[PDB]
């Protein structure tokens, strides 16, 4: 049994590939392979074109007061 090899390097080397978020763009807008097994044709083709939010709806919901409390169930 031998001790392992301790390979020492400069701490700056470990940050060579790191890029600050304010210096890089979002690569998730080109992520096609990440949608496989998670996103369906229904969501992309039928649902989202019909049920996308608009700025008007978002503003109306944000400005409007809180909805009334949900009524308690009644056996009727």
């Amino acid at each position: 049994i031998t001790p392992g090899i301790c390979f020492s390097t400069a701490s700056l080397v470990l940050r060579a590939t790191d890029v600050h978020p304010l210096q890089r763009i979002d690569m998730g807008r080109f992520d096609l392979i990440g949608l496989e097994g998670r996103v369906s044709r229904y969501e992309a083709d039928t649902f989202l074109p019909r049920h996308r939010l608009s700025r008007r709806v978002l503003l109306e919901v944000a400005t409007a007061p809180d909805p009334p409390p949900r009524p308690k169930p009644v056996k009727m």
């Binding site: 049994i1 031998t2 392992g4 090899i5």
Partner: protein, 433 residues
């Protein structure tokens, strides 16, 4: 023990002055070559020079490989001796230069002192301690001890199904837990338990043993290039997903050199430079020879013995470049050439007699003379190979010794290369291609 082609070679048969005795240690001739090999053996024993190359040159059957194995026998089993064939560098996993470099490091051995820490006893308490550690109680015939061990050791104990009453062996260096059996004291409780019982250890619970380990530089390189000592999931993953050999870098070899130098300075390691033997060197290509230039120029390299039976032959990997031994002239400038000669009929008879004694065969003088005459034509190898079939024929006929009739009958049954060549030439139109 089976009798191989060189089983009679026990040494170089040299006297105290270095001169070669005529017949000694299973060698009959090649006195000059044996003296040169004795000098090479002294060079290897000096452990001072690095990367010194020797070429054994001569026709086939002149005992070049016998002389290499005699050098090995003279050195002893402690000194590493790596035999490789030139055809073995053509691997489908690593480059030819990598194969050569790995064989170079295999020739350098290291005798290193190691201390093994052992926990051995019958388990009396196995209490987990919340990742969960383990508190274990071990008893022997001399005492009892309680130990706190890492969670990995607890996982190993669980995998071994160790329960209270089992005799276990723990190696603290490698964390290797072995369950040996249920204690013998419980072997009477049941009539069919499906258990293997083991007596109680009669020493102490904790033992320290110092042993001498024989390793090579290649072993260290492999251990540090394909690690399996962490016992973690990543090691298993790497072993299963990457089982092939890899081209070990010069950086790893430099680190191993530093570690071994540190070990030698600490006084716990001894270096044995050792020997590499390449038998069919002409099978190497120009790339291998060019690499071997720099490899032999290294101050770490071992002593390398080369062999060749080729004449003025085209170097493999070149189109039409022809060199005296199949070896480019640049490498021949870096080698010491030992020349082997053809054997006289008397030496052939001596070798035949030695081989007969080695194979446990009694041969009459008339049969020995006839077989030496047979070896004068054809080859010595063919004459030696007729000993066992002739012995089998004599045994079938009820004779305990080989007579001339058995040798004649066997030679009639089996042809040699020249006779087969004559048959092929006479009937070229009937054979394929």
């Amino acid at each position: 023990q089976r009798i191989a082609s060189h089983s009679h070679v026990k040494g170089l048969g040299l006297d105290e002055s270095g001169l070669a005795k005529q017949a000694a240690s299973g060698l009959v001739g090649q006195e000059n070559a044996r003296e040169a090999c004795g000098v090479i053996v002294e060079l290897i024993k000096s452990k001072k020079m690095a990367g010194r190359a020797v070429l054994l040159a001569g026709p086939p059957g002149t005992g070049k490989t016998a002389l290499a194995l005699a050098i090995a026998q003279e050195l002893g089993s402690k000194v590493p001796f790596c035999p490789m064939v030139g055809s073995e560098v053509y691997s489908t996993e690593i480059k030819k230069t990598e194969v050569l470099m790995e064989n170079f490091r295999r020739a350098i051995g290291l005798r290193i002192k190691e201390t093994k820490e052992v926990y051995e006893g019958e388990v009396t308490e196995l209490t987990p301690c919340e990742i969960s550690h383990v508190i274990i109680g071990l008893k022997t015939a001399k005492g009892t001890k309680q130990l706190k061990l890492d969670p990995s050791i607890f996982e190993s104990l669980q995998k071994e199904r160790v329960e209270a009453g089992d005799v276990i062996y723990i190696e603290a260096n490698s964390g290797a837990v072995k369950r040996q059996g249920r204690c013998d004291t419980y072997a009477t409780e049941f009539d069919l338990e499906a258990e293997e019982y083991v007596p109680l250890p009669k020493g102490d619970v904790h033992k320290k043993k110092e042993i001498i380990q024989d390793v090579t530089l290649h072993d260290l390189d492999v251990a540090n290039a394909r690690p399996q000592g962490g016992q973690d999931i990543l090691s298993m993953m790497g072993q299963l997903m990457k089982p092939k050999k890899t081209e070990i870098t010069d950086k790893l070899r430099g680190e191993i050199n530093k570690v071994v130098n540190k070990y030698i300075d600490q006084g716990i390691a001894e270096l044995v430079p050792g020997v590499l033997f390449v038998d069919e060197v002409h099978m190497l290509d120009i790339e291998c020879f060019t690499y071997l230039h720099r490899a032999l120029e290294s101050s770490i390299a071992p002593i390398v013995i080369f062999a060749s039976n080729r004449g003025n032959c085209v170097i493999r990997g070149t189109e039409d470049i022809t060199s005296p031994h199949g070896i480019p002239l640049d490498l021949l400038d870096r080698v010491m050439i030992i020349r082997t000669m053809l054997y006289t009929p008397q030496e052939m008879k001596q070798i035949i007699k030695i081989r007969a004694q080695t194979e446990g065969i009694n041969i009459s003088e008339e049969a020995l003379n006839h077989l030496g005459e047979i070896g004068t034509k054809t080859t010595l190898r063919y004459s030696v190979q007729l000993l066992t079939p002739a012995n089998l024929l004599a045994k079938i006929n009820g004779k305990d010794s080989i007579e001339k009739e058995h040798v004649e009958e066997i030679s009639e049954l089996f042809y040699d290369a020249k006779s087969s060549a004559k048959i092929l030439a006479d009937q070229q139109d009937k054979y394929m291609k």
